[PDB]
Design a protein around this ligand. Structure first.
Ligand code: HEM
Length: 152
């Protein structure tokens, strides 16, 4: 279920994300690369990237756009960490294009893990981050399951 964050936890999430927020595209590029390198089955899910060596696509506009769009959503989630309806709407809107896609929960969770690992958070900040991410996935998976209207 969705579990709201405290004022102090919101601050922790904002602070945790600050290094990434100040280098959003650069972080996106690195994290998305590491994701596709560690879990190569996922590259084929992206039609613009399918059929090319990862090292060949990593420097392309197609690749950087995809990475940027993932991180822009997370950036907007962080922006809305204190507004549950707003946070839910960000996810609801991005969920639509994923509904019909053959992407496992494993793949989504693998991406979450790459992001977590890159952030090297202490346990206080990590706890708050995981509260937000648990909310993210609750909303996302509800929407993938056709129960997105509950957040409207
Ligand atoms: C959970 C974090 C994720 C976020 C925030 C996110 C966000 C987005 C955004 C903003 C778009 C652009 C909308 C569009 O033009 O379709 C998109 C498209 C897409 N995403 Fe995701 N995504 C996530 C996870 C994933 C994962 C893990 C995969 C595959 C392993 C994936 C596969 C795709 C595909 C296939 C498209 C549309 C086709 C294209 O890439 O051009 N998404 N996503």
């Amino acid at each position: 279920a969705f579990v709201g964050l405290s004022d102090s936890e919101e601050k922790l999430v904002r602070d945790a994300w600050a290094p990434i927020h100040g280098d959003l595209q650069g972080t996106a590029n690195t994290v998305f690369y590491n994701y596709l390198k560690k879990y190569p089955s996922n590259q084929d899910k992206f039609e613009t990237l399918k059929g090319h060596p990862l090292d060949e696509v990593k420097d392309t506009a197609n690749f950087k756009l995809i990475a940027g769009r993932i991180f822009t959503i997370f950036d907007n989630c962080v922006k809305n960490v204190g507004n549950d309806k707003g946070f839910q709407k960000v996810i609801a809107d991005m969920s639509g294009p994923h509904v019909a896609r053959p992407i496992t929960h494993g793949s989504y969770n693998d991406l979450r893990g790459v992001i977590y690992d890159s952030m090297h958070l202490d346990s206080t900040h990590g706890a708050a981050w995981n509260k937000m991410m648990d909310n993210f996935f609750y909303v996302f998976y509800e929407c993938l399951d056709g129960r997105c209207s509950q957040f409207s």
